Design an enzyme around this catalytic site. Structure first.
Site, PDB file in Angstrom:
ATOM      1  N   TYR A   1      37.785  43.577  44.314  1.00  0.00           N
ATOM      2  CA  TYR A   1      37.714  43.276  45.733  1.00  0.00           C
ATOM      3  C   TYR A   1      39.109  42.855  46.173  1.00  0.00           C
ATOM      4  O   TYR A   1      39.942  42.481  45.339  1.00  0.00           O
ATOM      5  CB  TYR A   1      36.695  42.160  46.002  1.00  0.00           C
ATOM      6  CG  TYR A   1      37.127  40.803  45.496  1.00  0.00           C
ATOM      7  CD1 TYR A   1      37.054  40.484  44.140  1.00  0.00           C
ATOM      8  CD2 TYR A   1      37.610  39.836  46.375  1.00  0.00           C
ATOM      9  CE1 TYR A   1      37.459  39.238  43.674  1.00  0.00           C
ATOM     10  CE2 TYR A   1      38.016  38.590  45.918  1.00  0.00           C
ATOM     11  CZ  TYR A   1      37.938  38.297  44.569  1.00  0.00           C
ATOM     12  OH  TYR A   1      38.339  37.059  44.119  1.00  0.00           O
TER      13      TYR A   1
ATOM     14  N   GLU B   1      49.883  33.756  38.794  1.00  0.00           N
ATOM     15  CA  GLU B   1      51.131  34.036  38.099  1.00  0.00           C
ATOM     16  C   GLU B   1      51.341  35.546  38.099  1.00  0.00           C
ATOM     17  O   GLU B   1      50.387  36.316  37.928  1.00  0.00           O
ATOM     18  CB  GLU B   1      51.056  33.541  36.650  1.00  0.00           C
ATOM     19  CG  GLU B   1      50.029  34.296  35.783  1.00  0.00           C
ATOM     20  CD  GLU B   1      49.998  33.833  34.336  1.00  0.00           C
ATOM     21  OE1 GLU B   1      51.022  33.306  33.845  1.00  0.00           O
ATOM     22  OE2 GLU B   1      48.938  33.999  33.685  1.00  0.00           O
TER      23      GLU B   1
ATOM     24  N   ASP C   1      33.944  43.869  33.554  1.00  0.00           N
ATOM     25  CA  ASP C   1      34.782  44.986  34.026  1.00  0.00           C
ATOM     26  C   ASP C   1      36.078  45.122  33.240  1.00  0.00           C
ATOM     27  O   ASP C   1      37.156  45.304  33.815  1.00  0.00           O
ATOM     28  CB  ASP C   1      35.056  44.931  35.538  1.00  0.00           C
ATOM     29  CG  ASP C   1      35.383  46.317  36.127  1.00  0.00           C
ATOM     30  OD1 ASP C   1      34.852  47.333  35.626  1.00  0.00           O
ATOM     31  OD2 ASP C   1      36.176  46.399  37.085  1.00  0.00           O
TER      32      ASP C   1
ATOM     33  N   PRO D   1      41.565  49.127  31.220  1.00  0.00           N
ATOM     34  CA  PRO D   1      43.033  49.005  31.255  1.00  0.00           C
ATOM     35  C   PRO D   1      43.627  48.437  32.548  1.00  0.00           C
ATOM     36  O   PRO D   1      44.549  47.621  32.483  1.00  0.00           O
ATOM     37  CB  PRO D   1      43.495  50.444  31.042  1.00  0.00           C
ATOM     38  CG  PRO D   1      42.451  50.994  30.115  1.00  0.00           C
ATOM     39  CD  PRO D   1      41.151  50.377  30.552  1.00  0.00           C
TER      40      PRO D   1
ATOM     41  N   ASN E   1      42.507  46.256  34.558  1.00  0.00           N
ATOM     42  CA  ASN E   1      42.258  44.819  34.700  1.00  0.00           C
ATOM     43  C   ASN E   1      42.901  43.967  33.598  1.00  0.00           C
ATOM     44  O   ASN E   1      42.602  42.777  33.460  1.00  0.00           O
ATOM     45  CB  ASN E   1      40.746  44.547  34.801  1.00  0.00           C
ATOM     46  CG  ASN E   1      40.127  45.131  36.069  1.00  0.00           C
ATOM     47  OD1 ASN E   1      40.827  45.431  37.034  1.00  0.00           O
ATOM     48  ND2 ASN E   1      38.807  45.293  36.065  1.00  0.00           N
TER      49      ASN E   1
HETATM   50  O1  LIG Z   1      46.539  42.593  38.531  1.00  0.00           O
HETATM   51  C1  LIG Z   1      45.463  42.253  39.124  1.00  0.00           C
HETATM   52  N1  LIG Z   1      44.512  43.160  39.148  1.00  0.00           N
HETATM   53  C2  LIG Z   1      43.447  42.680  39.800  1.00  0.00           C
HETATM   54  N2  LIG Z   1      42.434  43.559  39.900  1.00  0.00           N
HETATM   55  C3  LIG Z   1      42.687  44.988  39.663  1.00  0.00           C
HETATM   56  C4  LIG Z   1      44.126  45.466  39.825  1.00  0.00           C
HETATM   57  C5  LIG Z   1      45.110  45.893  38.933  1.00  0.00           C
HETATM   58  C6  LIG Z   1      46.319  46.240  39.553  1.00  0.00           C
HETATM   59  C7  LIG Z   1      46.353  46.113  40.942  1.00  0.00           C
HETATM   60  S1  LIG Z   1      44.793  45.533  41.422  1.00  0.00           S
HETATM   61  S2  LIG Z   1      43.573  41.035  40.401  1.00  0.00           S
HETATM   62  C8  LIG Z   1      45.199  40.935  39.760  1.00  0.00           C
HETATM   63  C9  LIG Z   1      46.140  39.775  39.837  1.00  0.00           C
HETATM   64  C10 LIG Z   1      47.485  39.940  39.203  1.00  0.00           C
HETATM   65  C11 LIG Z   1      48.168  38.874  38.602  1.00  0.00           C
HETATM   66  C12 LIG Z   1      49.424  39.067  38.007  1.00  0.00           C
HETATM   67  C13 LIG Z   1      50.034  40.324  37.999  1.00  0.00           C
HETATM   68  N3  LIG Z   1      51.247  40.552  37.433  1.00  0.00           N
HETATM   69  C14 LIG Z   1      51.801  41.776  37.440  1.00  0.00           C
HETATM   70  C15 LIG Z   1      51.160  42.870  38.034  1.00  0.00           C
HETATM   71  C16 LIG Z   1      49.912  42.718  38.639  1.00  0.00           C
HETATM   72  C17 LIG Z   1      49.322  41.455  38.637  1.00  0.00           C
HETATM   73  C18 LIG Z   1      48.084  41.209  39.220  1.00  0.00           C
END
Ligand SMILES: O=C1N=C(NCc2cccs2)S/C1=C/c1ccc2ncccc2c1
Lengths: 258, 295
Positions: free
Chosen positions: B16, B78, B124, B127, B129
């Site tokens: 989400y 972070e 879930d 890769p 996540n």
């Molecule tokens: O990376 C995150 N991914 C979340 N859900 C699915 C997604 C994967 C990529 C874009 S959306 S929540 C989330 C938080 C988060 C925290 C630290 C990070 N550091 C580097 C790159 C992405 C990051 C994402």
């Protein structure tokens, strides 16, 4: 019995202390009383019945309300709004299919608007600092049920009934931890149905002896005996259903022989 | 407060909301921002926040702050380097050595053991996540689909977990599922890291099942007691023989094949727990190798 049963029990014991509401908050409330809270919790029981919600959802809502009221003064005309927002949040947390916001607005007899419910949801979340994964009497009970020799459906439903009754009366149940109420309710249910007592295996799991549960047990025995005479009746009505093996129709024991 | 943050770029969308890269102007800290626009606050957000605030572990993404305003909700995380899907897409064929895979799996199992020990199902694990940093760490992320479970479990939401990573007990419609579903997902991910392609890339539920059966054999009562009574079991299921794991995942050693086998066991309660997996001989020589820097 998974590889995590002990870890989880230990963790829930830690978290129930951190999630505990302020024992004497009702005295500091300028406008609301234990009686008014009893009316609210009984009404939440009805709501849970109307929408076929989990007992856990009910237990969670009550935890949220008591924690909210532990730091927030609420006028009597606004208590139901707090309760509605808490039930909504508990439902979002716990239910596969939460009732929609409009359905929560409906069962408040149009006292409140949608915007009010939504704004109260936000405030509850702020006050509880989004910390919604609280241990409940129900969570301890289902763990204790695994120690039956063998499993008895009537005992299970009776324990849940007794533990549910404790939600209604802040005096005295606010001073007791969920794990202790669950122990008292499980022993009392086990005694009423089979004649057996708080089992050795649970004594060793919980560190709770019959003696340690006695204070809570004495209170719960009294609530059970006085249940038919209680102002609030929705839990007895609920636990008449075959779904809970009609356990509220069972006779409470005269004495516990403690 | 959003004043102190300067957004750098959009990264993508999770379970989400939308994830952005940002920088704390005062501390210099690079952060990930997960924005949600406000039926009230979504169940997914309520669950993620509550559970992620409880979970403090080196291999679970750190939730730093919740910025709670009238019309917008920001979760502050972070920032690490990259998600594992992107890392695999950016990696050359030889780009993910076995020691790194072993390190990553060891760490993911630690993070998952922690989740399960704290009554949290992730539900879930894929890769996308999973997030890596430049120093060799990998962390579980996106708890939007997670939930707090009870002991013993109730029936929870059906058809959960992204299809390719979904356990057979979910596919066959069992009344109860629990921690074993996350282990199944991790096993699929383990094989994917080694072979550099998805293990079971199905396009529908039946295709997913038939793909699983062709690798592991069609389950019967011997391998999985109660399987023929499961709601979505069909006696017309084609019978396929289980194949050698030397052929399922060729680059893998005997210990690796052993561990994968235990992670992909049909019977959920015979399936290895994250806790037990940490002591598997596969990890006897585990280190913490560093990944390449390509984005
Ligand atoms: O990376 C995150 N991914 C979340 N859900 C699915 C997604 C994967 C990529 C874009 S959306 S929540 C989330 C938080 C988060 C925290 C630290 C990070 N550091 C580097 C790159 C992405 C990051 C994402």
């Amino acid at each position: 019995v998974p590889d995590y049963h002990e870890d989880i029990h230990t963790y829930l014991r830690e978290m129930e202390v951190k999630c505990k509401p302020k024992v004497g908050y009702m005295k500091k409330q300028p406008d609301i009383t234990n009686s008014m809270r009893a009316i609210l919790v009984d009404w939440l029981v009805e709501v849970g019945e109307e929408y076929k919600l989990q007992n856990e959802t009910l237990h969670l809502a009550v935890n949220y309300i008591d924690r909210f009221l532990s730091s927030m003064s609420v006028l009597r005309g606004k208590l139901q709004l707090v309760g509605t927002a808490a039930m909504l949040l508990a439902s979002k947390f716990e239910e596969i299919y939460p009732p929609e916001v409009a359905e929560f607005v409906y069962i408040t007899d149009d006292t409140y608007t949608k915007k009010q419910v939504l704004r109260m949801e936000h405030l509850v979340l702020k006050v509880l600092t989004f910390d919604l994964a609280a241990p409940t009497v129900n969570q301890f009970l289902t763990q204790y049920f695994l120690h039956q020799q063998p499993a008895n459906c009537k005992v299970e439903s009776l324990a849940m009934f007794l533990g549910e009754l404790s939600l209604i009366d802040a005096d005295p149940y606010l001073k007791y931890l969920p794990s202790v109420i669950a122990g008292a309710a499980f022993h009392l249910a086990l005694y009423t149905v089979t004649g057996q007592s708080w089992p050795e295996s649970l004594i060793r799991k919980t560190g709770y002896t019959l003696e340690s549960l006695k204070p809570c047990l004495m209170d719960l025995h009294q609530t059970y005996l006085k249940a038919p005479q209680h102002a609030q009746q929705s839990i007895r009505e609920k636990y008449k259903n075959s779904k809970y093996h009609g356990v509220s129709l069972l006779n409470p024991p005269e004495t516990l022989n403690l | 407060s959003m004043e102190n943050f300067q957004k750098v770029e959009k990264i993508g969308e999770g379970t989400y909301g939308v994830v952005y890269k940002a920088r704390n102007k005062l501390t210099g800290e690079v952060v990930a921002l997960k924005k949600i626009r406000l039926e009230g606050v979504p169940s997914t957000a309520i669950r993620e926040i509550s559970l992620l605030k409880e979970l403090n572990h080196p291999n679970i993404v750190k939730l730093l702050d919740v910025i709670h305003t009238e019309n917008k909700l920001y979760l502050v995380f972070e920032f690490l380097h990259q998600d594992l899907k992107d890392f695999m897409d950016a990696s050359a064929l030889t780009g993910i050595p076995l020691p790194l895979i072993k390190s990553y799996l060891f760490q993911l199992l630690q993070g998952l053991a922690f989740c399960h020990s704290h009554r949290v199902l992730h539900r879930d694990l894929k890769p996308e996540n999973l997030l890596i940093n430049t120093e060799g760490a990998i962390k579980l992320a996106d708890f939007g689909l997670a939930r707090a479970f009870g002991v013993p479990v109730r029936t929870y939401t059906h058809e959960v977990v992204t299809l390719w990573y979904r356990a057979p007990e979910i596919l066959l419609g069992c009344k109860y599922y629990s921690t074993a579903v996350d282990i199944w997902s991790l096993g699929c991910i383990f094989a994917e890291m080694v072979t550099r392609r998805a293990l079971f890339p199905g396009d529908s539920e039946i295709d997913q099942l038939f793909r699983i059966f062709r690798t592991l054999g069609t389950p019967d009562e011997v391998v999985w007691p109660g399987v023929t009574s499961m709601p979505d079991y069909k006696p017309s299921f084609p019978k396929w023989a289980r194949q050698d794991f030397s052929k399922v995942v060729p680059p893998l050693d005997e210990d690796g094949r052993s561990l994968l086998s235990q992670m992909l066991h049909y019977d959920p309660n015979k399936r290895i727990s994250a806790k037990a997996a940490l002591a598997h001989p596969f990890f006897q020589d585990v280190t913490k190798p560093v990944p390449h820097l390509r984005l």
